[PDB]
Amino acid sequence: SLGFLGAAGSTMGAASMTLTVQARNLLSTHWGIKQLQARVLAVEHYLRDQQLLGIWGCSGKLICCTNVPWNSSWSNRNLSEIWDNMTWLQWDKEISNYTQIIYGLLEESQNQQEKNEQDLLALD
Amino acid sequence: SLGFLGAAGSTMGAASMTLTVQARNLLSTHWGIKQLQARVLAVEHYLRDQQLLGIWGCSGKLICCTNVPWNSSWSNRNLSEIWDNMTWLQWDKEISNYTQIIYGLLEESQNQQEKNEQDLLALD
Amino acid sequence: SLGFLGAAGSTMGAASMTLTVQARNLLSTHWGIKQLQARVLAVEHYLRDQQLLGIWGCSGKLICCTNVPWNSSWSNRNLSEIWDNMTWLQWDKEISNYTQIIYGLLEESQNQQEKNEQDLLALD
Amino acid sequence: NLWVTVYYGVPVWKDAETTLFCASDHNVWATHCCVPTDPNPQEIHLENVTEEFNMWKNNMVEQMHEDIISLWDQSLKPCVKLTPLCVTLQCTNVTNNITDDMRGELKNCSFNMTTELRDKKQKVYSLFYRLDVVQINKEYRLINCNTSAITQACPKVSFEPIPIHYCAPAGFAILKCKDKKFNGTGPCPSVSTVQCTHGIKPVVSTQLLLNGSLAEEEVIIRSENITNNAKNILVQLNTPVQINCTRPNNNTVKSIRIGPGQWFYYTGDIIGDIRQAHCNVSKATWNETLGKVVKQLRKHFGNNTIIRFAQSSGGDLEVTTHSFNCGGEFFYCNTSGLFNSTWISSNDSITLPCRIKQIINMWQRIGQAMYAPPIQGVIRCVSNITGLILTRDGSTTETFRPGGGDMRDNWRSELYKYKVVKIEPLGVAPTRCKR
Amino acid sequence: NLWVTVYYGVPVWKDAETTLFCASDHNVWATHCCVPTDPNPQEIHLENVTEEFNMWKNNMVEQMHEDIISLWDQSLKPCVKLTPLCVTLQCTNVTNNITDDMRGELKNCSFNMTTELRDKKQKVYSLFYRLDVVQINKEYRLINCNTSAITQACPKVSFEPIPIHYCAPAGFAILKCKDKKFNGTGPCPSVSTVQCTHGIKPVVSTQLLLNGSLAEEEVIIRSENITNNAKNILVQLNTPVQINCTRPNNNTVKSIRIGPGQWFYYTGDIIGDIRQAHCNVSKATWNETLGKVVKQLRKHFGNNTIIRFAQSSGGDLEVTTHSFNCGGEFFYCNTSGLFNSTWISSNDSITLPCRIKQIINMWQRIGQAMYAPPIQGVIRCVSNITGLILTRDGSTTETFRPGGGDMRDNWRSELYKYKVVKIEPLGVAPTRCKR
Amino acid sequence: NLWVTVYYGVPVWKDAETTLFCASDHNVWATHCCVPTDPNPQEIHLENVTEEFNMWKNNMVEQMHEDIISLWDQSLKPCVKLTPLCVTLQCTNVTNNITDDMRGELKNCSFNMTTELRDKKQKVYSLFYRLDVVQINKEYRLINCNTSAITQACPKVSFEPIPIHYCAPAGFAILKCKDKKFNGTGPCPSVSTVQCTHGIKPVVSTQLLLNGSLAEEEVIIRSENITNNAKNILVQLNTPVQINCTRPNNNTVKSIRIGPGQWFYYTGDIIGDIRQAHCNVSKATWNETLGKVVKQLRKHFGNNTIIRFAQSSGGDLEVTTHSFNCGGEFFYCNTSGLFNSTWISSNDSITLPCRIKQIINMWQRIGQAMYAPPIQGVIRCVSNITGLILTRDGSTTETFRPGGGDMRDNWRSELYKYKVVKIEPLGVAPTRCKR
Ligand SMILES: *[C@@H]1O[C@H](CO)[C@@H](O[C@@H]2O[C@H](CO)[C@@H](O)[C@H](O)[C@H]2NC(C)=O)[C@H](O)[C@H]1NC(C)=O
Ligand SMILES: *[C@@H]1O[C@H](CO)[C@@H](O[C@@H]2O[C@H](CO)[C@@H](O)[C@H](O)[C@H]2NC(C)=O)[C@H](O)[C@H]1NC(C)=O
Ligand SMILES: *[C@@H]1O[C@H](CO)[C@@H](O[C@@H]2O[C@H](CO)[C@@H](O)[C@H](O)[C@H]2NC(C)=O)[C@H](O)[C@H]1NC(C)=O
Ligand SMILES: *[C@@H]1O[C@H](CO)[C@@H](O[C@@H]2O[C@H](CO)[C@@H](O)[C@H](O)[C@H]2NC(C)=O)[C@H](O)[C@H]1NC(C)=O
Ligand SMILES: *[C@@H]1O[C@H](CO)[C@@H](O[C@@H]2O[C@H](CO)[C@@H](O)[C@H](O)[C@H]2NC(C)=O)[C@H](O)[C@H]1NC(C)=O
Ligand SMILES: *[C@@H]1O[C@H](CO)[C@@H](O[C@@H]2O[C@H](CO)[C@@H](O)[C@H](O)[C@H]2NC(C)=O)[C@H](O)[C@H]1NC(C)=O
Ligand SMILES: *[C@@H]1O[C@H](CO)[C@@H](O[C@@H]2O[C@H](CO)[C@@H](O)[C@H](O)[C@H]2NC(C)=O)[C@H](O)[C@H]1NC(C)=O
Ligand SMILES: *[C@@H]1O[C@H](CO)[C@@H](O[C@@H]2O[C@H](CO)[C@@H](O)[C@H](O)[C@H]2NC(C)=O)[C@H](O)[C@H]1NC(C)=O
Ligand SMILES: *[C@@H]1O[C@H](CO)[C@@H](O[C@@H]2O[C@H](CO)[C@@H](O)[C@H](O)[C@H]2NC(C)=O)[C@H](O)[C@H]1NC(C)=O
Ligand SMILES: *[C@@H]1O[C@H](CO)[C@@H](O)[C@H](O)[C@H]1NC(C)=O
Ligand SMILES: *[C@@H]1O[C@H](CO)[C@@H](O)[C@H](O)[C@H]1NC(C)=O
Ligand SMILES: *[C@@H]1O[C@H](CO)[C@@H](O)[C@H](O)[C@H]1NC(C)=O
Ligand SMILES: *[C@@H]1O[C@H](CO)[C@@H](O)[C@H](O)[C@H]1NC(C)=O
Ligand SMILES: *[C@@H]1O[C@H](CO)[C@@H](O)[C@H](O)[C@H]1NC(C)=O
Ligand SMILES: *[C@@H]1O[C@H](CO)[C@@H](O)[C@H](O)[C@H]1NC(C)=O
Ligand SMILES: *[C@@H]1O[C@H](CO)[C@@H](O)[C@H](O)[C@H]1NC(C)=O
Ligand SMILES: *[C@@H]1O[C@H](CO)[C@@H](O)[C@H](O)[C@H]1NC(C)=O
Structure with a gap:
């Protein structure tokens, strides 16, 4: 398409229905140094995003529902105003100051989940 | 062994019983560039195969069963011929013209499944 | 903290409560090679550990429970001697002789598990 | 009520700077070192996307500049050095077939040159173009002897430009501006995504831009700040102006060995009459073209003002004169015949006289000189003027003069349509699901 | 009914071209740059696997060629440039202890050489071998003064071949053919997988192959096309032929300074009588060896044909003679005494006369000459002939002659059994499992 | 009834050797090529962690040594070669204004050097410092004409140390020892983790260490093996000793073109009287400092022993004197005035005479000489003595002398507190969890 x-x-x-379109293009004699630097950089960026998905418990997924509630202080826009009347470029700008907060919450939540799973599996 | x-x-x-034998051996003065290119290339190939398993919903597995039906137009053999008489090299040479069809279908199936899960969890 | x-x-x-703390610190003329080699090496080490988790069925976890029983011949101590009265550096030395045995067992139990999953999913 | 949901593969990006690599389909541009191109390249139109472009802050220009210089220098690394040539020369005038245009332009110089054996010498004479030779006190020396060493360009390596495509690495993309009448700094309502730029020919010139892209609807005038005087004005033309350049002399090229495996090339003689190099521009086409430029200037300077064109005020030949490579020879053409008019609200050509130089200092550097060996026979080339570089003088009359000299402004005329962005596939949004 | 199942770690591969790296273990081969070897490697036999090998399309050969040349050149980068040696020489003949054969093969040349100080000169004399000196008009110059610079090889760097192992990168594997009596181009029913090749010694020779692998059952004859007379034939022997080579003269080596920390090495004098260099091949062994070679040639040429061996056809010494490095000296041996027989169905040697050169142009390049400093004392080396390079003339007799010159043909004799493949671990197959 | 549980992100490590990279913040250390630093670097204290350190087996020292040499050499690569300057010199003594401290230290030499044009020569007069010139038989030669080429250091590139931070790559960390009174080889009860070291100035000196770190509480004596004689003793002071060095001569510097864009710098003349270079150390501070050194030395040699200090016994200036770079000039100061006492259980300074050299052979290599161009005017520098390098002679009296020469001993005095470890985040332990 x-x-x-x-x-x-x-x-x-x-836009959410085309996520694989972008995912598939990640990762796809002095002048050999530029080529290696370019290739290495692409790998490093790929891995950093994958590492976060790992830490947050979203590894292997394109869409990942988590247990962190949404705070109206980040944005109080209605879902019909977000999903139907905005593009992702606009959304990214609207919440760009809260991404570190959200990321910290996502990793802490998964860490707590790792620990609760471990304990339930310890019961016979 | x-x-x-x-x-x-x-x-x-x-042969399907030795998948870890092969998997564990993947990823393991201008000469500095020559050697470094060899190392970078091994990483890039590893990551591309992992990316496909990710996209298809087979991340972390050596054996992965999906929801894409097999078409007799790709290959029409008895399962006993495929699993008991043929080797993998022979199989690869018969199905080689369909791999870009099958891979496309695997991707579409996983993307639809993730959407369905996301919607179902709206009720949880 | x-x-x-x-x-x-x-x-x-x-220390089990600080696992994300260390995970996040992985991956983050003539010299243009010296620096590049350092970057490539960091990636290679990261990936080797991730591959082992993958083949043990621990690809998305920080704390992964397995099906391999603990042998008293590797270490015969009580839980409160290991978890409350010892640190990780000490533990690592204590069982450094048996890590290869344990890893081999983990690889095998995962293979037994994947085959059993494949067979059960064929029954319907 | 709402929960955080993480999405990967989100179509967003950020302005970013990364290192680009070249693609390209014996050449001073070493195109054999570049990546083969995609025979069926993709371009994805982005509907409802408006981007901010700024051609004056575009780092693609800086990378092209650095790669061009580095490729240039690499091509000279294996070539014969001419250290043995920096000797006292004994020179007289070439007076044999002078049409009075060339009086004093060519000098006949003899010298003692080294040879294959270090205990032998040979007497050699050759012709020089004056601009390359300076007087010592009939004692002359090459002009570079008190500043720099000379490397002879390899006679087998072409200087002809070959289009170079700049490509982004995975994880990055190049956005292209498709709007007409785009002035280089505003928002661009119609854009598309490509992985590689179109091929750009690294044409080197100093006042007029040659063999570039044309504007499609009108002459477009671009500048960083049009009301300043410190900035150059880049004018992109709608139609080409054809220019015919020649060095109408039949050269006989001779060579000598100056050491083991070291050959030196020089002009031995000239057969027939000696005439000046020159370029032809048609008057009718030029007049219409310049009139179009004036019409567009009036949008910024007034419909009741006077627009005057004049010659560059002074400075080095490389700046005041229009320089280019034609068939391997380096020409310095006088454009005073093109910019000599005041605009107030046929087969009749313009002849621009040209000078030739063999000792060349490129990229405005000091210490690295190149010797361009002569080309045997007669040289003729035809090229398109696709743009101009003008400056404006610091009443009711504005005056414009040829500018240029700084090579980065030539590349800005081709790269103005492109910007590099980083793809940022990971992000979050609220939704109804939880887990 | 059936579902696609994805498997990872599938034991399949495809032909591929990748970069191989060296892992070998004061030498021209940078074995110190290469990766250390594994104590014992793992060779895995593949039961029920037949694979196609083609020794003539093997890209491992091209890489070996490029790596050897690059290492060779790197070893000369820090060595003395003998620029000041290219002078007029005053040469006379060495006549003091000359036997009839080696008469006129040594020149006694004097010249003016530079010293540590720019303002001083020294008179030096040395011995040359004629092959490396040419006449100017008594006045001589070194043979390469009109084409190249000469770099003196460093006296502390050995030219003795050290085995080099070629290793595949992760994700690739090297398949090896274990088929005895394998001709290099067909299916090989018995193969194994290795990560690195056996060590291969980069022995350089032109007509006879020295110190290689032997055939295990019989003499094996290989070529791209056995009926195409334009192709070379590589013959692998199953038994070595021992060859004893010597330079039976006691050289006294002198050294002078030619510049600020630079020194030149040369033969000063010869102690005792002057004798021709030569190689010894046993007659019986050589005659048995040819008998085996012709027996095998008849399989392609007929059981009622005539097989005749003759000398080389012409060209320079590098192709008309058998060249090799013996103790640091470069020998050019006349093999006409070996290839002189017609084949139709005790303590006695063949002596091959040899000449020595000091100025050497390797790898058939132009512009890069090496000066091999002389070796003090008397030289003797013993080596094994493990194969031959033969050509065939373009109607009852098939005439064969020594071939050579193209170095890739030597490598092909060790690399014929290896192929590089890419591992392709991901694939699909139908099963009854779904989800 | 326990099961293996796998944990990832486990806080453990192993001793390891990896490559560290340069971070920093027109200088021979090429700091423009280093990673800019973190303005707010972190240090994380590790409670209840005891580590073993061994400063004598610390591979960070070896890397710093290699980086410093490589940075040094690449900074001379593009500078003017002085090959044409190795000529016979005609020299007489400078006797115009001598305070007989300098009686015969300076010589006035004349020579014939090259010019921009090959056919012309120039007569030049210059002053040399004796240590740089040797007699041939009045006829002199530069001292290194029979061992090396000389490269002139670029006059625009500073030799002043700039702090360098060494940083570990991801996956590695540097542990720092925080314990006071730590002698470099035992367990360290208090440690912390850093990613980069503090900045270390690459100060190059012998015998006395300049501008380093001070001990927190007391003088610390460190050695690999204190009872050997084959090892040097590194003494870290807890207070600086101020040393004031100068060359009180108003030298006038001249510059001559020696070739096509090449130029040689030299001392033309000296304004005023000619005096000896020297360094001033206060006696009171030095005597208190030395007494502290003795007090802590008795701990290993006996509190009833005799400690005696003496001058170095022999070798070249690099080891017998205190070498340092002061304002670009290279000084060789005689320290026998400091190490002259026996220790048994206002504004009065020690003056150390110093010599100056221009032809320098650093890192104890042979074949690479540097010419340090003179610095115009009068030079003065003030620095801190922060440590000593001492040797011990092979009864009742222990005799100590200044040591030095091996540069790794200087860097080891700053890097003694750091070690590199590899992080090993994956591990297992028994728990009651199973799946
Ligand atoms: C199985 O494969 C066949 C062959 O590709 C598919 O049939 C084709 O379908 C296209 C429309 O997409 C038609 O234009 C072709 O003419 C059909 N070819 C034939 C031979 O019939 C078929 O749809 C596939 N079936 C499934 C369940 O995947
Ligand atoms: C795990 O083993 C350790 C060591 O044997 C136990 O510590 C001792 O346990 C015995 C009972 O078996 C007591 O009598 C000792 O007094 C304990 N030693 C001390 C002083 O700590 C430990 O108790 C065992 N498991 C537990 C804690 O139940
Ligand atoms: C080329 O070499 C010749 C040498 O024959 C130079 O001729 C000499 O020139 C000098 C003056 O520079 C006279 O003093 C000699 O008497 C000349 N020698 C003869 C016999 O010709 C010649 O000058 C050199 N090249 C130039 C600069 O003309
Ligand atoms: C564009 O150029 C104009 C000048 O033509 C700049 O305006 C001047 O700014 C300085 C500094 O504030 C003032 O002192 C002058 O009086 C201004 N001149 C005029 C005519 O207004 C303007 O700032 C430039 N804009 C940009 C973005 O660089
Ligand atoms: C190579 O092929 C042979 C068959 O030609 C395989 O041998 C069979 O192995 C199975 C399983 O043990 C036995 O039930 C059959 O009876 C064997 N056949 C014969 C003729 O003996 C052999 O295992 C294959 N090799 C490998 C490595 O897979
Ligand atoms: C090496 O052996 C192969 C067989 O392994 C020979 O292959 C033949 O090649 C010709 C080419 O014209 C074909 O027509 C034949 O059908 C092939 N035979 C077989 C059995 O495949 C090859 O010619 C031999 N080469 C040499 C030099 O001996
Ligand atoms: C090549 O040299 C070897 C020795 O390096 C010769 O072998 C010797 O032959 C004689 C005569 O039969 C024996 O007495 C010696 O004992 C042998 N030496 C050794 C070490 O075995 C060989 O004959 C020579 N071959 C030729 C063609 O000259
Ligand atoms: C370092 O060790 C001390 C013990 O020597 C740890 O402090 C104890 O922590 C426990 C658990 O919170 C308390 O019940 C004790 O009362 C504390 N004892 C003391 C003396 O403070 C300290 O937490 C350890 N540090 C780290 C980083 O683990
Ligand atoms: C530095 O201090 C350590 C103590 O931490 C000293 O180590 C000891 O060495 C002596 C002599 O070998 C032994 O008798 C001790 O038993 C060692 N103790 C330990 C902890 O192993 C070390 O010798 C001191 N070094 C110097 C130069 O003072
Ligand atoms: C981020 O903070 C700045 C003030 O520092 C504010 O101007 C900007 O609008 C904020 N952006 C968002 C998305 O809240
Ligand atoms: C652009 O907006 C129109 C509505 O004005 C919409 O129909 C169209 O689909 C949008 N384009 C894209 C790519 O979504
Ligand atoms: C030679 O050229 C100079 C200009 O460089 C001129 O002054 C002189 O008159 C000319 N001589 C002749 C004979 O034309
Ligand atoms: C380009 O367009 C922008 C629109 O915002 C305007 O501000 C700028 O002055 C224009 N520049 C030129 C040279 O036309
Ligand atoms: C023009 O040059 C030719 C040689 O190419 C010569 O014969 C002729 O005399 C010259 N013309 C004049 C006016 O001297
Ligand atoms: C120059 O110095 C040397 C130093 O050994 C001395 O012997 C000589 O006499 C001095 N010459 C003069 C003129 O002072
Ligand atoms: C320079 O060269 C001349 C050649 O005649 C010689 O006499 C003179 O002594 C040389 N000058 C020096 C300082 O050696
Ligand atoms: C050296 O003497 C000159 C005399 O003109 C003076 O200008 C200069 O400042 C003096 N330099 C020093 C360091 O005293």
């Missing part, structure tokens, strides 16, 4: 980033500008609800 | 490619030539139903 | 290896020296059960 659309190529890489062809969904940009569409609403978030529409 | 036959060695790295020791099961090659055995039938598919036998 | 104890930002990196700050739990070293604390008991094993105390």
